[PDB]
């Protein structure tokens, strides 16, 4: 449910991404990069309520779901590009 293409270069931060989508966290479709399940809006809040970074699976914006959040909370904005 999340396939983001140019010129939507995509950020790494959730509130910023919401800007790209011209919307807010309260609306944004962000899924698990890993589980492909759309995050519960509460979990989507977790992301910006803390200091996590968005993870693009291949090149689409996904958040890190409930399960993955505890796993990948270590990653707080990484420069893994290309
Ligand atoms: Zn997940």
Swiss-Prot record:
Residues in unnamed zinc fingers: 32-68
Keywords from the named record? Activator, DNA-binding, Early protein, Host cytoplasm, Host nucleus, Host-virus interaction, Inhibition of host innate immune response by virus, Inhibition of host IRF3 by virus, Inhibition of host RLR pathway by virus, Metal-binding, Modulation of host cell apoptosis by virus, Oncogene, Transcription, Transcription regulation, Viral immunoevasion, Zinc, Zinc-finger
Give the transmembrane region(s). Answer: none
Q: Provide the protein's localization.
A: Host cytoplasm; Host nucleus
Q: Give the primary localization class.
A: host cell
- Keyword Zinc listed? The answer is yes
Which GO MF terms are attached to this record? Answer: DNA binding; identical protein binding; PDZ domain binding; zinc ion binding
**Gene Ontology, cellular component aspect:** host cell cytoplasm; host cell nucleus
Question: What is one process in the GO biological process aspect for this record?
Answer: symbiont-mediated suppression of host transcription
The job of this chain, per UniProt, is described as: Plays a major role in the induction and maintenance of cellular transformation. Acts mainly as an oncoprotein by stimulating the destruction of many host cell key regulatory proteins. E6 associates with host UBE3A/E6-AP ubiquitin-protein ligase, and inactivates tumor suppressors TP53 and TP73 by targeting them to the 26S proteasome for degradation. In turn, DNA damage and chromosomal instabilities increase and lead to cell proliferation and cancer development.
An additional note in the Swiss-Prot or TrEMBL entry is: Belongs to the high risk human alphapapillomavirus family. The cancer-causing human papillomavirus E6 protein has a unique carboxy terminal PDZ domain containing substrate. Part of the antigens expressed and presented within HPV-positive head and neck tumors.
Family the entry assigns: Belongs to the papillomaviridae E6 protein family.
What is the annotated quaternary arrangement, including any partners? Forms homodimers. Interacts with ubiquitin-protein ligase UBE3A/E6-AP and thus forms a complex with human TP53. Interacts with human NFX1 and MAGI3. Interacts with human IRF3; this interaction inhibits the establishment of antiviral state. Interacts with human TYK2; this interaction inhibits JAK-STAT activation by interferon alpha. Interacts with host DLG1; this interaction leads to the proteasomal degradation of DLG1.
Task: Write the protein's name.
Answer: Protein E6
The UniProt gene name for this protein comes to E6
């Amino acid at each position: 449910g999340a396939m983001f293409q140019d010129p939507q270069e995509r950020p790494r931060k959730l509130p910023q991404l919401c800007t790209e989508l011209q919307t807010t966290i309260h609306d944004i479709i962000l899924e698990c990069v890993y589980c492909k399940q759309q995050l519960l809006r509460r979990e989507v809040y977790d992301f910006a309520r803390r200091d996590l970074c968005i993870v693009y699976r291949d090149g689409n914006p996904y958040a890190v779901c409930d399960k993955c959040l505890k796993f990948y909370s270590k990653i707080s904005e990484y420069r893994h590009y290309s």
